[PDB]
Design a protein around this ligand. Structure first.
Ligand code: MPH
Ligand code: CO
Ligand code: CO
Ligand code: NA
Length: 262
């Protein structure tokens, strides 16, 4: 079932959350044309282990071979870092990090634009982030998760894009992927009322083209069926008494860390 975090649990999540956020802040300068994704993965891993004294939740999870997930352009999610995959001007890339500290998980991701952005690329990233922010602003006790997925969907579709159905947000804590499943679209199947102390991620994947996706033979990599660009952003949050707190907020986020309702 859905686990409710204690205040002590929450304090541990703030640390793990901030650690994950920090890897993203740190890597930025390395994201440039000509760098390989395998190299970004090594830099991230070194930092996590050697400086942070933490651990990557990804390494070995169901056999996942690397420390972070790096998805370029049409890759939806779960792209596997590789020494052979070099970044080019105009690429949009997602770096998804999940760190474990004192047994608690922190899961977050953001898009990076390599070199000179393309119009589509910039637009897609922006809209994707806005859709995540919109959802964040709605979080509060008593509301049904269904409403959030529906708002994201309506927003995204209104902008001419599509939302991926298959992958979604999830509870997180001592476990990497806990209940509940956080859908990024409107579904009659969803019936979950939020309560304070719940911790979960929101991580909408938006496609410039059609919603359909396909899983690669590697068993992890996900791509759009039509090869259109896909973007994603992710934050880990905790439901509070009058709103929410964003555990993985970064210096470049433009949303406040604590959102209060009244
Ligand atoms: C190789 S497991 C990686 C899982 C991602 N952090 P997420 O739970 O955001 O999809
Ligand atoms: Co993630
Ligand atoms: Co996640
Ligand atoms: Na992508």
């Amino acid at each position: 079932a859905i686990s409710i975090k204690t205040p002590e649990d929450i304090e541990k999540m703030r640390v793990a959350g901030r650690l994950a956020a920090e890897v993203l802040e740190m890597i930025e300068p390395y994201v440039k044309p000509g760098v390989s994704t395998g190299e970004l993965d090594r830099i991230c891993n070194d930092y996590i282990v050697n400086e942070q004294h933490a651990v990557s939740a990804c390494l070995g999870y169901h056999g996942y071979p690397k420390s972070v997930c790096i998805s370029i352009n049409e890759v939806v999610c779960h792209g596997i870092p590789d020494d052979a995959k070099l970044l080019k001007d105009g690429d949009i890339v997602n770096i998804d990090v999940t760190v474990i500290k004192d047994g608690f998980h922190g899961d977050t991701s953001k898009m990076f634009i390599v070199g000179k952005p393309t119009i589509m690329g910039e637009r897609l990233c922006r809209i994707t982030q806005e859709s995540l922010y919109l959802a964040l602003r709605m979080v509060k006790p008593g509301i049904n998760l269904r409403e959030i997925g529906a708002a994201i969907q309506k927003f995204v579709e209104a902008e001419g894009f599509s939302v991926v159905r298959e992958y979604c947000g999830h509870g997180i804590g001592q476990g990497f992927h806990e209940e509940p499943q956080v859908l990024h679209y409107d579904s009659r199947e969803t019936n979950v009322v939020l309560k304070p102390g719940m911790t979960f991620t929101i991580e909408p994947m938006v496609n410039a083209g059609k919603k359909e996706i396909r899983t690669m033979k590697d068993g992890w990599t996900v791509k759009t069926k039509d090869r259109s660009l896909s973007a994603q952003y992710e934050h880990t949050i905790v439901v509070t008494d009058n709103g929410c707190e964003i555990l993985t907020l970064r210096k470049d986020d433009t949303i406040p860390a604590i959102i209060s309702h009244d």
